[PDB]
Structure 1
Amino acid sequence: AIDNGALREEAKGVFEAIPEKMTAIKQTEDNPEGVPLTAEKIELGKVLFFDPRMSSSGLISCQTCHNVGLGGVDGLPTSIGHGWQKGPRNAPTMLNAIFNAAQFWDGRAADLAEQAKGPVQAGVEMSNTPDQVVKTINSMPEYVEAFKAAFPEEADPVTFDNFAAAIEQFEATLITPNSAFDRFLAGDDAAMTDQEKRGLQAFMETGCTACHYGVNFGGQDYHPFGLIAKPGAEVLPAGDTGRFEVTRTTDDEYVFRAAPLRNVALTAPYFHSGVVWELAEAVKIMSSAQIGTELTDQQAEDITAFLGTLTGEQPVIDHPILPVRTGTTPLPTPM
């Protein structure tokens, strides 16, 4: 009941593979070469991503909530940050985030550099200020040396904007090539089991591809959560109106960015609300809410199996050795 060639041909018309490596970002028709990724900026960004002294507590880094061992997420319903404060939304992965059209569940940041300024300043996340970050960095000569070399022409290289640019460069390399689906797409019939291929068939036939398409199986545009039927009160909490918070436009109530499904098997729990632990349940909810069809248990299990083939090679990251604090480095303030 499986036609590999047919399945592959349909899939190539709507999805594409994650690239093997990244060398530039922000390529447009207007600026075709884009912004080069540099070894110095990637390395600086890695150090900063793992440095919990970028938070006011001294205890929270990006890695705290975007754990590179847990698919780039924290595995909690919603994140817990400074002072144990609980946030409103589930932490999405930074893996492959570079390919999404906008960042956050409501698309309120245009790119990774704009995004990175948010957690630093948010009271429920790192609860810090831009000038505190700069003063912290400037207190450690190895960090200053790195910024001066990474941003070589600038009179003022150690800036919050450049902190964000370095993090963006590092995150642009956090991609996950060679998932079983990408290997099947490239020609290996044996890369996926029959059940996983039945799931791929069902995902394409049911209409999931209207919102989950391209390189990231999502992440490109915005849709009501409940296009055809509302999900429950716990899954769609009434107080989080999604895109409406950004656009203040009537049609945008409970409109969210389509989740990019790469590595979804690693990033439970699901949806922006984080109350659905079972991926098969998220699949059933999506069919009911977005398409108005009830999936059979077999179709939901098949689709869930298929979604597992979107797990790519996870980055192997040696934890950086952080610069040592000096006498005027700001003291941690967890309390």
Structure 2
Amino acid sequence: ADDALAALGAQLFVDPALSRNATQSCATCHDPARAFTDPREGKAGLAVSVGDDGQSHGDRNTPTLGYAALVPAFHRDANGKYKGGQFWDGRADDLKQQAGQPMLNPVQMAMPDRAAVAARLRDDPAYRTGFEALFGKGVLDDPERAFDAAAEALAAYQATGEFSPFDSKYDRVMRGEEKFTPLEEFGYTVFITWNCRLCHMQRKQGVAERETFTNFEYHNIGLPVNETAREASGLGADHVDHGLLARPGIEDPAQSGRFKVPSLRNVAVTGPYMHNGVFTDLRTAILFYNKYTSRRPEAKINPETGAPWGEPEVARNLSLAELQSGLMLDDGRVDALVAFLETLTDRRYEPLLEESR
């Protein structure tokens, strides 16, 4: 059942018959050889992904599915902070609610509706057999059931150890099986004593058993629009990605421009970075944080463009308290952080670090 449901999800995940033109499976955008992100080039580089029509681009960067199964379901905590959920704006409560959305999105897999999905599942005798064993006879005749079941299988598959193996060097080091290089060790010390820890650690204090390097909260760190992405997505020059406020049922204008803190696991191999893929290099993402702290003019310039970072897409609700730490990361500490973040790469993706290094 647990095994079998995931095994079904495994099959669906790679099955392009879930896209209108049959060109695209989850695996196409969440490619297992790329820590489940999209290696494909589109009109905005790797910032945003192309759908099954071959033309439609999204407005956000395809995130890893690695460790996404550790994220709690979306909720508001007692301190009025939203946490968890799926999608950069948390608009899906959890993996199961998320799974069906790329299928029906005309900018992604573009199936017209649930019935079209179920017709596809019915065409395949392995699916009749697999779905029926788990969900019962005729499940694939009922589009609502078939679609829900396909989401469930896909959520199950993403909860397997294959997606969250905890076998990064960092994991190995925390087991006592090996040691950090001294650069990695300094990186870890910086990470845990600087402001990164205020957002990129599961817990406020104490020790997490399955650390994924995010507190699953929502923060506006004051990123600019990714203009090439925004052009490709076609959403308009006057469009504002309001982040969490876009989630249905969120009305508080203080949530405007806030996005889910990503897990930094496999961060080294899942560029480009941020919700709009705006920064191509990991070092850039780190340096962006100096804009709140450094008094040096260079701290205001995106090193990838040589131009100012740009006005925030959403100039209000910035996390200034956390961001304005009073301390600038010098290059040695940025280098250290890169080294440390690379230790968060799963064992099987270690060979990918060669090219990024």
TM-score w.r.t. structure 2 length? 0.72
Give the letter aligned to residue 176 of structure 2.
G
Give the letter aligned to residue 77 of structure 1.
A
Contact conserved, 1:82 with 1:124, CA < 8 A, in 2?
yes
Determine if the alignment matches structure 1 residue 243 to structure 2 residue 244: yes
Aligned partner of 2:323 in structure 1 is 291
Determine if the alignment matches structure 1 residue 97 to structure 2 residue 46: no
| TM-aligned CA distance change 1:140 to 1:212, over 3 Å | same
Among 143, 149, 155, the alignment partner of 1:168 is: 155
Contact conserved, 2:169 with 2:347, CA < 8 A, in 1?
no
**1:112-151 matched pairs, under 5 angstroms:** 112-128=95-111, 129-151=113-135
SS of residue in 2 equivalent to 1:260: coil
Among 219, 224, 231, the alignment partner of 2:220 is: 224
Partner Cα separation in structure 2 for residue 66 and residue 196 of structure 1: 28
Among 22, 30, 48, the alignment partner of 1:78 is: 48
Q: Which has the higher contact order (CA 8 A, sep 6+)?
A: 1
Shift of 1:82: 2.5
Contact conserved, 1:176 with 1:314, CA < 8 A, in 2?
no
Q: How many residues align?
A: 273
Partner Cα separation in structure 2 for residue 142 and residue 202 of structure 1: 51
Give the letter aligned to residue 98 of structure 1.
A
Partner Cα separation in structure 1 for residue 21 and residue 290 of structure 2: 42
Contact conserved, 2:225 with 2:276, CA < 8 A, in 1?
no
Shift of 1:288: 3.3
TM-superposition CA deviations, 1:176-219 (whole Å, max 9, x none): 3221111111224x431000110111111112111111321016
Give the letter aligned to residue 243 of structure 2.
G
Does 217-226 or 135-144 show the bigger shift? Answer: 217-226
Among 194, 202, 222, the alignment partner of 2:190 is: 202
**1:14-93 matched pairs, under 5 angstroms:** 38-75=2-39, 76-83=46-53, 84-93=55-64
Give the letter aligned to residue 30 of structure 2.
H
Contact conserved, 1:41 with 1:166, CA < 8 A, in 2?
yes
Aligned partner of 1:111 in structure 2 is 94
SS of residue in 2 equivalent to 1:225: coil
Contact conserved, 1:52 with 1:58, CA < 8 A, in 2?
yes
Contact conserved, 1:181 with 1:309, CA < 8 A, in 2?
yes
Contact conserved, 2:22 with 2:52, CA < 8 A, in 1?
no
Partner Cα separation in structure 2 for residue 135 and residue 89 of structure 1: 30
SS of residue in 2 equivalent to 1:160: helix
Partner Cα separation in structure 1 for residue 348 and residue 98 of structure 2: 22
TM-superposition CA deviations, 1:138-159 (whole Å, max 9, x none): 122221011111224x663661
Give the letter aligned to residue 313 of structure 1.
R
> Which sections of structure 2, spanning at least 5 residues, go unmatched?
40-45, 73-84, 203-210, 231-238, 293-321, 350-357
TM-superposition CA deviations, 1:64-86 (whole Å, max 9, x none): 10000011101411111122211
Give the letter aligned to residue 251 of structure 2.
R
Contact conserved, 2:226 with 2:277, CA < 8 A, in 1?
no
| TM-aligned CA distance change 1:118 to 1:286, over 3 Å | farther
Shift of 1:233: 4.2
TM-score w.r.t. structure 1 length? 0.77
Aligned partner of 2:261 in structure 1 is 258
TM-superposition CA deviations, 1:258-297 (whole Å, max 9, x none): 1110110010000011121110110111343452343111
SS of residue in 2 equivalent to 1:44: helix
> Which sections of structure 1, spanning at least 5 residues, go unmatched?
1-36, 316-335
Among 211, 226, 233, the alignment partner of 1:234 is: 226
Partner Cα separation in structure 1 for residue 62 and residue 226 of structure 2: 17
Partner Cα separation in structure 1 for residue 251 and residue 348 of structure 2: 38
| TM-aligned CA distance change 1:285 to 1:265, over 3 Å | same
Aligned partner of 1:18 in structure 2 is none
